[model samples]
Target chain A: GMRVIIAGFGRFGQITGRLLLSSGVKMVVLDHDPDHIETLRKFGMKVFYGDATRMDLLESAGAAKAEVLINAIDDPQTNLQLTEMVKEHFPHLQIIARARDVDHYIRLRQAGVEKPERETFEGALKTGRLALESLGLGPYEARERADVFRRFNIQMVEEMAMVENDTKARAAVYKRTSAMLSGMILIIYAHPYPHHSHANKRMLEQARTLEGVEIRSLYQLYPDFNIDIAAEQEALSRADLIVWQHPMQWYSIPPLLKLWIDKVFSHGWAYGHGGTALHGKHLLWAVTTGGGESHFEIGAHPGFDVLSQPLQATAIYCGLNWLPPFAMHCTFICDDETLEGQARHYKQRLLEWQEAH
Target chain B: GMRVIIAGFGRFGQITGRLLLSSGVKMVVLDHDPDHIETLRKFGMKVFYGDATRMDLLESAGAAKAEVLINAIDDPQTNLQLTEMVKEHFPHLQIIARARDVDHYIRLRQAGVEKPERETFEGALKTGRLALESLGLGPYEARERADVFRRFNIQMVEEMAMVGMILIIYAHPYPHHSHANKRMLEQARTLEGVEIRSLYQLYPDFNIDIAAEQEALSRADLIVWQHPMQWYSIPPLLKLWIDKVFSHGWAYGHGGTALHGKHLLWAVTTGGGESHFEIGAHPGFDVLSQPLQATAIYCGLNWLPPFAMHCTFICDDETLEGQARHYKQRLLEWQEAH
Candidate 1:
């Protein structure tokens, strides 16, 4: 009777069930939507029509016997309370939590849970790869092209924290690990507001002390969403490496970032038909999160472990190398000590990558 | 000194002026909207105030000397009356009219008018190409992909006509030269008890079979507006098409087109993205009037047109060559049609 229990059988939980069920694992699924339960039943899937977040329903669904309880509900607080309830009563059950991003990941981890994946997850990267590869170029070349996309991966880490406020300035800072080297960084900055302007300013000042790095602000480039293609491509091509520094907006890059991807990634010049100009360029993810390291621990985001799907997977799919991530935790409260330390660590890490190469 | 006199110095007239100007022409632009005329004045472009269709205003604007007069006012009856007055006074001025679409186009042409561009014109195809390219496809690919988009378009046309007691099955039907073979065939199979009318279809058949057509429209539930292109005009036959279908005592005034309160959905597909459909696209025609061609005119039936834009595949060719799988999937209508 001891098994796994999953709640809120929407898209994420549905996929999880199939993955587990295909592996011969039997788990009980609970959902609030009558329509969804009916849909599950039509699939011959044994699902319960009850909110699994409720202790009574969980108990009735054999959560007492369940060794692992997964609350993959869509809401953030509902998932948090469900995790606490399962932890309180079904103390022996290993609780898995799914979170939208970093702050959620951190808070869930703090409340004694593990595993969170952004709703969009790694699939966007996979979709991105297919989209890129279909444009032409050989497999390796296509992959290398995706490598430049690694810069985009950093946004999700910020998404977990702010849930909604990842600005382009912050994104630019995150996109470049080697702050002082590249000519012009084209970060896919999202969100209307920047986080920690003072910390960012200090970092920028320190970054300026380093040699040969230029950051031409993309925010000012197209405040009106009219991203000039020739200008954007000119900036990208001018840079030796591309850095996508920004916070996450929505469960992905902000609308501007999404729009930028559509506008900036010109077909022939960027990756298709005689479009190998950026084939082997380097890309690094310099992401900042508002949550502590523990937030990314397994089951931290509730039901799902943080980092199960590295947001960087999108970059790999875009043909960029998976450069080691430079993440700054607890963005809002990081004092001068932590901020300065992380800034120095970022600079050192950049130099170390150059040294290693 | 005889030339075209464009009424309504708004966005549509401004662009129409540029086109005619580029074609090496001259015109007297008259508008009642003072703000529009003033704006034109700033650019040193002369635009006069006062209703151009009014006899006094018309005489002053050189109506007698004019070879062509365009009744481009947005209002339906106003434009219609203006057409009549112009025809009564300056019958030789070759009135090239701007009707909302099939219904008005038919009325103007039937009432002894000259040229009536149903008001959704060539710019539709051109704008569609730009929309696809903006979605991240190559310019050449966008053009090629537009050609492949005919399949869904034709399917839409066939399905709308297949319905029962339909009001009018209007459309920016594919140009006669363009390929719409499959959709055309599919329609022939299901036009039963269906009083179907294709504006583009009866276009070349200028001598419409009106009596037989009136008998069919006597009973219809859905009136369809299906067109592919949008300039400032509807598909060529749309106006004449509307006049033929909306017969006296059935569609309007006293004997109204008893098909009142019917759902006249717009099934127009456009290439332009959501941005251009607004004040954003060049020459910036207001989003309201341009795309929803039939709704503005369908007051008798009071039906509205529904639109699907960028519904064709953009970017990825893999998605394009075979019916644009994703966009095609979004169209439950196409699924039902087949």
Candidate 2:
């Protein structure tokens, strides 16, 4: 008697319907759009045409037989109302939903929908994946997962947060929920003199322990400047995202990293002729500055954002997407709690990345 | 027997005078300035208060016995005259001179001065070297060599002849669509000592040959970034070229001084006229040029004042032709001047 109920079949639902049907899963598909219902019939999915919120229609559609419900309504408000009714009436049934954005996502979750996926997210996720995967070694399997969480967290905090919910958001929602493929991260670590700075050391300790992340400490590994290009390229091929961990010098990346760039990112390989190796991978420009942000922002130096131009520009030129930089301004912020929090932040970001992938 | 003769003991002469005297090079120092002669006397050097150009003063100050003459006259006119007198009067003696600038150096050299050192050359070299090397950190080698070459080349170009190498980075995303840019580039290509590397035409996919580009850069004496001002900065391909080519460990940073003391010319064209910039539809060209200017400065390149042909879209055929010709004139002028 276990079956899946897909309500309000739209673009999101059609694919799910087709996929599930192909797998020979029993499903009760319902939609109000006569055109949609008619369209699905051509695709061999016989969707019951009616408003899913109406209890009589659900009863007739054998809603009792359904073990799972996917609210695939295109509109969030209608979707929210339907979720509310379905949770109250079909109390035992598990529910999932499609959300227009975080506003809809939060409200739909409040209405008792479990795990609402953003409307345009799959297209973004898939588009970032498929094009790169075609290159044979471009993007990591789940690099999109880490990037999506990273992008929307910053985007929502500044762009979407309402006055009341802004503080509530500061406490959370940088995390995402998914059971997907594993993500591979490459941390191209460079620190010339690691003996002095315990910040990078401790941070590396936290990072190295992380599952599925490979740390290639450039200075430690290749002090002789004898970098193995094939090995570096092979490691890059395995990664979906790269985190450039280093200490700032000359107001930019240090020499070893630069040397790494010159050697590893060679012509006809990383960027030029037939070098589609890193086309869609993301690069997170993470550095620990010797001076604090204040010195950079209003004092002597340009901030990390301005300083990030060369590295970011380097990444973009080589067909890599740039993520928001994680800069830990030292001397002032290198205290135990702050450093621990920063390391924690790094660990959490990575863990979430691993979780997402 | 007398040995070294220092004439016109200004700041340039005073240091050399004291330096040579301490090295125990027997010397006769003469200066027309009463204060300078007095100043050198306190530093334990006797200066004869007389014009060096006067043959009688030179003869009286052991001109026949003195083997070397330093024409450190503060004034170029006076220095040129003094050099002329010393060359004729002391025909066998070696003459070294201080130059106020290129004109002074050229004048002194023509007057038969053995070596004419520029007044500000050493200071510029020292300053550029000190700042860059003080913070220098690198994994590899050969920074000192680069600095040495840079210092010598700075003097070489400033003191000497035909502009050694003028590399023009011509970046136009839509080169085919460009009217003014293409025309200017066409003429710039024909100019002697000028090499124009068109970014878009070569790397349509933005795949810059960093090694080849950097090779061109290292060989270049004057770097001209010629492009249409798109969105107030350079085109994407140019910025990409900059990102790729103007790399760390080579263009700038520790062990990287390829651009040091090389001249940089920002030759740009604008769609809007000069008035459009003032009214704030776009900021002034200088404001728009901050990144490039900063980049040039940071790399220790001598940033020449920007060249702009404003109102590219509205300009007439005659105006465009003039602009192209004028553009050619500027490069020719720089090449000749340097």
Candidate 3:
């Protein structure tokens, strides 16, 4: 009862056609490959030998009557051209296209193809499933995970196709994804003179009251620069939110905090060589800078661009979500009331984050 | 007392040789391009005819004793090979080679070359200066700006040869929709050390090449996710890319350390004004950025403070252009540090 026209009878086309043919579907195959056409014709299979992009060739193959047009071409440009032609000529026919990658799939979707299959993604996933099995997971478990991931992947692809055309829908997806809270926050506090500070100390005290907030005072804990790497890792592993709460020392993290980072975030554990411990956690930078907002702006002592490179590089390397840093600028000279206000704001933010999670 | 051997007597080699010849320095040139060699020989210039990669050809050209070896070859591979051979054979010889691009320059540096020059980059800058002049900028101003940019470009390229690459994953669904993002992209595209890959252009159907994306991340010293703030976050394909490309064993989890020590920059254009991104206006931009920031840190990338261009729709062309220039300048500065 099904009528299918397979264009570009390369390896992809032949396999698709053979499956459809066996399923009692009427098939009209078109191929530009001379060798394949010659061999197929010898085997008594009806295959047209011409460019599928040509309208005359398409008409001759009864594209008007075909229920579905399967674009199985390897070349992206040719496939897209043929898709345009078929959509214009046979508006009734559904187009199923073969995509080279994610890029090709999106272009095909934009070109009006309802369903676009990536040529190698499925095969790659199959290989990945095998890899997982080789990595000591049971065959069924590996297959199960692969199946779940594939479903999520396909759903995202389909949703994205629509999202591309609709700006509002795209934004909606963004808001939903970004709004998510992952619970547990790990505050890595590093202030050398906590006893002498009014603003940072109050902010630290404010953070302590938060239900899900876990504070690790770097200087108090590791006074001699001796960091317990395993303990720090264990803490980081359990955290969904990581806060680097420190007074900006010389436009960056304090020396003790930097030392802590150099020690705590090890090569094999936090990053490099199967380091997936902090994969989904979020990093929040709560810095109390001595300089004002003007000083951090363009053409100032510590330009906004100057400080964040190391932090950005570090957070991204560890597979953590780098939340927009909370910069408490002009902390050295600000009044106690302003400090209290800032501390309240900080506490509220932490609470909101925990609530979201 | 200074002697030099220039490989590949093409357009690059010919100009360099002629400049040095007039500068009271002795020059020995090698070229495999038969047409150039024939013309050079006819002009009474002594040019060696052979591949520069060959040790015998280099040895015959006095490379063993030459104080400086200027590799002006058009091909990157041959220039690199000749560099290795020259360094191995002549320990005292200072090697200065021409690179095809930023990647080539980095590869040459990795191969132990002290200095590698990009062939077309300088010429492009000269042309850009002229173009600026054509665009109503005074000759002096255009020249000054070009010179400044040239220095920055060269410094970035040289520094990049020592540092890792930076990959900019750009996602703007509607190219014609936003004027600000387009200008920003155009400005970024001209920078020497930055590699820009557009998501919409590359993957329309949203079927990302996970392997290729991962490789790009692995090679980068920094990763920039540049997009217009749709729903206060990144575009769908980019999100899909983050979810798929940054998987366990490569980005994070067990054995997934491909992006360790890399930097991540979030550069987004917003339709709303800064006023709209507050407690009650819409959604706080800071709150919105949580997911992306989390994603970068999760992947072991150092998260840089984001560069968000707000009120893109209402921003004037002049303001947009200024912002674009600022953005480009910031990236250049970022490259300088890392």
Candidate 4:
């Protein structure tokens, strides 16, 4: 029986609706693109080209009669707004929404949607697993780690609630400098907008309090992306432990940090035969995320380790030891007290590792 | 003493004009952007905004009096068109132009430009060298390799006369265990003048002949690395081949200019389907290729975007044949391009 309503029928929605019908649970689909309904609409099924945001359009689509609603609108804001409008009218309808990011996911849950699904993650993770399978060792090896990413379950709901109550709080988690308590720690801190940071700045401040830690705020130095190669090389040569401290942007490092990497890591110097300068050094990835620990869990999004592939590979290729990454989750929902505690713990671990090494 | 008339005052022209002036040989920069001619215009220098394609505008900029012309326009077409127009009027003028790509570089040479400078390369090499300075390992180490990239003086007139060579390095861990790869290998062996080196059979003990490997690469216009994905990289023997065969002073050192300008194609097979390759989680297979891509770039080798085959285990003969044909077409197309 057709008991589901699918809004915004692009590739994801089109495939989703078709699979549902073929699998024996169909949907009433709606889209704004004129071509979508003309070519893709089933012969007997009700597929219309109309804005689902309109109250009457969804009404005509029988949203009130539908048992489930799939909000796969291309625009995240529009999806949330449409979900809110529908929930006020169809109180009995089960709303499952597509979240653009983790922040949107939390807001969707707060909006009383049954499930805020990261539908984009499905295709992304699929391709990532596909990329790994060829190495004769990847599908199982990478998927094994990705399975850990999908492990955390339903216990993370109430944690998402407080963030809605406390507003967007920012904090960063810190990890111990693994296997070495080495001297002259170099922290390459890069935040595009330094003043706007509540988390990265605090973590930096805590590290600054220590004696051996040398923090190079990359943006403050290279505003024009003009990194000083000689100066950086001299610093890199001396440091025993290197820490990349920043907020994750687009699942990678910040633009300036990447620019610094592009500029500072040379072919013959950082790699190649003569590029053995950073060979025995240790690298620590200290990062913060807008999403909570639970959100990245349970197959919703990629886990931190899996996301850290590029940075880790780069480090390992350069012959640097990759330390266990310290990630503070739910910074957008973290309070000042939690952030301060995170900073203190960050300092303590760096100190403990220093003493231990 | 200033005899060079600079055209197109973007980064290439601006720096060219300034450096010439600083060196006492620069003058008269012309650009299309109104904003560029004003703020970037040197106080005592003649910098103005006008379409250089106009004969009147170029004449007013003193193109006839200039001994040399620098065509540094942002657009490759405009740069070439401007040079064509300027060369007809000022037959005595020596024109140096910035080429966007190798294809553009060849066209620029054919149009009689003295030198088709690779504008992006100098800065790329600058930062590339800068990257090494951070480690302080080779204070002079990486600089030597960059010099080799700079040393290449392309003579396309004679280069076009010769037929191109393509080297395919097939590194399947065990080709006997393969279905799709063996079919693909068979197709490769049939292509005339396209050298296919099967690593497993060539060196069963992994004792690679460096002399033989380097000699093949020396004549090759393109190097296609055909291998199945292994731990997000090449099989260990292939890696060893890279490490052992691509030695210093032969592959990437000061004298290591052999592989420079040679195009590298990564032809890899994935055991999983396209749906299993994720961008957010493990990074797409292309991103995992940083090790090879970055390494290739450092050696002055041009990297072709990866050509990948997926779902090898479950793929049918027809599908496998289709992939093999695509692979064959790619090699033939590359050869024709040369």
**Judged by lDDT relative to the true structure, which candidate is superior, 1 or 3?**
3
Q: Against the true two-chain complex, what DockQ does each candidate achieve?
A: 0.01, 0.01, 0.01, 0.02
- List TM-scores for all candidates, in order: 0.32, 0.32, 0.31, 0.35
lDDT of 1 by residue, A189-251 (tens): 332334234444444555556555565444434432345676677777766556555543211
What tens digits encode model 1's per-residue C-alpha lDDT throughout B67-116?
66656676778888888897788867666556554457567767675445
In Å, residue B91's CA in model 1 sits off its true spot by 22
Clashing pairs counted in every model: 73, 2, 50, 22
lDDT of 3 by residue, B182-269 (tens): 8998998887767888876565434466777877776778788888875334554565567568787888779888888888888988
DockQ of 3: 0.01
lDDT of each residue in A234-316, candidate 4, tens digit only: 99998988999988653446655764665577888887779988988888889888777554432212345666766776676
The TM-score ranking, best first, is 4, 2, 1, 3
Give the lDDT ranking, best first: 3, 4, 2, 1
lDDT for position B118 in model 3: 59
List each model's interface RMSD: 28.9, 33.3, 27.4, 25.0
Across B55-171, the per-residue lDDT of candidate 4 in tens digits comes to 888888778777777777768899899889987888866677777655677787788764466544333333333333332323233443444333432334227423168898988
CAPRI grade, predicted model 1: incorrect
